[PDB]
Amino acid sequence: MELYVNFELPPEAEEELRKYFKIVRGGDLGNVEAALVSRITAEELAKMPRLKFIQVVTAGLDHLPWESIPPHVTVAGNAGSNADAVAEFALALLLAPYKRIIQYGEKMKRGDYGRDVEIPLIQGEKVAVLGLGEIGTRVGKILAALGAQVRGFSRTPKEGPWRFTNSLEEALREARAAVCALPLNKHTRGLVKYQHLALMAEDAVFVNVGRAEVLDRDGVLRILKERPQFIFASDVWWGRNDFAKDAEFFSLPNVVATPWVAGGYGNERVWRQMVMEAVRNLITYATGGRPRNIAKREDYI
Amino acid sequence: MELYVNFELPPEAEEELRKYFKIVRGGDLGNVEAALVSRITAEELAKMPRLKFIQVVTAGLDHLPWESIPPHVTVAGNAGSNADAVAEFALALLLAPYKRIIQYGEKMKRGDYGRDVEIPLIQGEKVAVLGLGEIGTRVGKILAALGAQVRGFSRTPKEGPWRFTNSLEEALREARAAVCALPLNKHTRGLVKYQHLALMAEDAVFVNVGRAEVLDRDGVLRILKERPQFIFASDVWWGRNDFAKDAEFFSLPNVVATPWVAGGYGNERVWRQMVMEAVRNLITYATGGRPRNIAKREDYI
Ligand SMILES: NC(=O)C1=CN([C@@H]2O[C@H](COP(=O)(O)OP(=O)(O)OC[C@H]3O[C@@H](n4cnc5c(N)ncnc54)[C@H](OP(=O)(O)O)[C@@H]3O)[C@@H](O)[C@H]2O)C=CC1
């Protein structure tokens, strides 16, 4: 189970991977079966004779090659490794435009001191939360604790402080806000569409904090151009790291945008934690433990 | 019992008041034993010899003449009538600048897509909360629930999810944030001073949602001009409704400002509710019960 490191592992992250395995970032690899990576090229794969499994330090899996994959090796990723960080980021992403903080701050700066914009309340409000558990759940918990009529959506039922649904639609219905945190698989691609978004209040604020591809880019753009009061606040984009590609969104007055920094690429501590959290997981993929987050090819096929 | 009323009353309120009082909005006020106002001048106070109770709609009472209110009049205010509204507003006021939403949104707009700014975490962070109960408390509970090391400050001890203190100073010490919601009396005037503020992290976010006078205006200005990373986010100002007077703050890049709209003057629903609650307290007074929020005169002298 010699270990292959696709990137830079900090001290502990390393000096805790030596109490076990080989370490291999150079020369041939044959006889590794390791993992610990962020991304993977079909190339790096074929150049690693017989691999046991694969451990992505991320929390998503939609990027990984797939076709160039052994229907056996299985994948053990993270998730909840950054649940807290991303959680609080989505709340900020929601309240900033929701309580009209950003808007009024602008008016103040320009000299406008009128109170012509009404401040929406969260209490007693219908708020959707697409994607439950880890992130979705922490958000849902807080919204509810703030007095919101949270309507949690998800594939497998079972929940808590909210009216769970199995229809993204019925959660967005007349909803005044939504915090999306769905993972991106073949079932989540272009899931939320114009028609769905349009079921929300014309005044709504839609927060996206998980993969952007979950929303039909064209739909978002369209509703944004129709409903001035509709706000799209997202830390994730279709341009996935390019950004420049989605600049047409950033120039819309009703859009709040952050560079995919909701924890992970935005906070060093969170990164190290995600890593030391991959550490403790790799470890068990030997000590015959339980492979947490094990994927399922067919969800992506 | 005649009740004086000097402001537009929601139909819901008038209906109820008429079952208990003889509303009077002008003419001879000699038999008024009344109350119910938002503001009151000494000119009005002189016309009400028999005034024995004064129910204020707002949560604070510093704006009242006091020096013109006979010492036996009994003044009860609201409070908690807008606790939730103001509560969520403070969180928004905190998270917007804290999680760097406002700042990154700007960078995105200008084309800057770098991730050079680290995103602070709330979890495990030292957060002060000057003023407990009603607003202070709701804020404190949420911060704590987000994993913050909340340090609640207040006059009379007794609390919950936090390390209560009786020294504003020891709460701000190396604190990364503060949500101020103190009422303004003779003990809170210029309470927080430069020296105290300076005990916070040079990277701190100070949120003021209660009366501004509680902070020494010059101190705020000074620390803001010294610590670029230090942020002052407030919905209340020394200019008290003028704003123009505090324009020098709005032009500082490390200030977030809103026009005193944290519920009340910012949301119609919240206003109506404050009025209904005021009308309810007045009625219990009328029916011989103990009205809530009786003011302790010496707090304002
Ligand atoms: N900006 C805005 O939109 C609004 C701001 N406000 C402000 O908030 C205040 C109401 O706050 P709220 O949360 O509702 O609570 P209560 O309404 O009045 O506030 C009482 C709390 O603060 C404490 N307190 C009062 N005086 C002092 C003091 N001198 N030193 C230390 N603690 C003190 C109390 O201690 P104890 O119990 O010992 O007195 C208690 O914890 C108003 O008076 C007003 O100034 C209100 C509404 C809207």
Q: Any overview of this molecule?
A:
Two copies of one chain form a homodimer. The first copy, chain A, is of the alpha/beta class and 301 residues long. Chain A folds into two domains: 2-82 and 264-296, NAD(P)-binding Rossmann-like Domain (Rossmann fold, 3-Layer(aba) Sandwich), CATH 3.40.50; 83-263, Rossmann fold (3-Layer(aba) Sandwich), CATH 3.40.50. Helix content of chain A is 28%, strand content 8%. The first copy, chain A, is built from ten helices and six strands. Chain A has a six-stranded parallel beta sheet. In chain A, helix 9 links the parallel strand 5 (231-234) and strand 6 (255-257). In chain A, helix 3 packs across helix 5. The longest helix of chain A is centred in the last third of the chain and has 17 residues, at 268-284. The radius of gyration of chain A is 21 Å and the shape is elongated. The two termini of chain A are 27 Å apart. Chains A and B meet through helix 3, helix 4, helix 5 and helix 10 of A and helix 3, helix 4 and helix 10 of B. The site of NADPH dihydro-nicotinamide-adenine-dinucleotide phosphate (NDP) has 32 residues of chain B, from helix 3 and helix 5.
Structure summary:
Chain A has helices spanning 11-14, 42-46, 83-98, 101-109, 135-145, 169-172, 194-197, 217-226, 247-250, 268-284; strands at 126-130, 149-153, 177-180, 205-208, 231-234, 255-257.
Set down the secondary structure blueprint.
The structure is a homodimer of 301-residue chains.
Chain A: H1 11-14, H2 42-46, H3 83-98, H4 101-109, E1 126-130, H5 135-145, E2 149-153, H6 169-172, E3 177-180, H7 194-197, E4 205-208, H8 217-226, E5 231-234, H9 247-250, E6 255-257, H10 268-284
Parallel strand pairs in A: 1-2, 1-3, 3-4, 4-5, 5-6
Helix pairs in contact in A: 3-5
The structure holds NADPH dihydro-nicotinamide-adenine-dinucleotide phosphate.
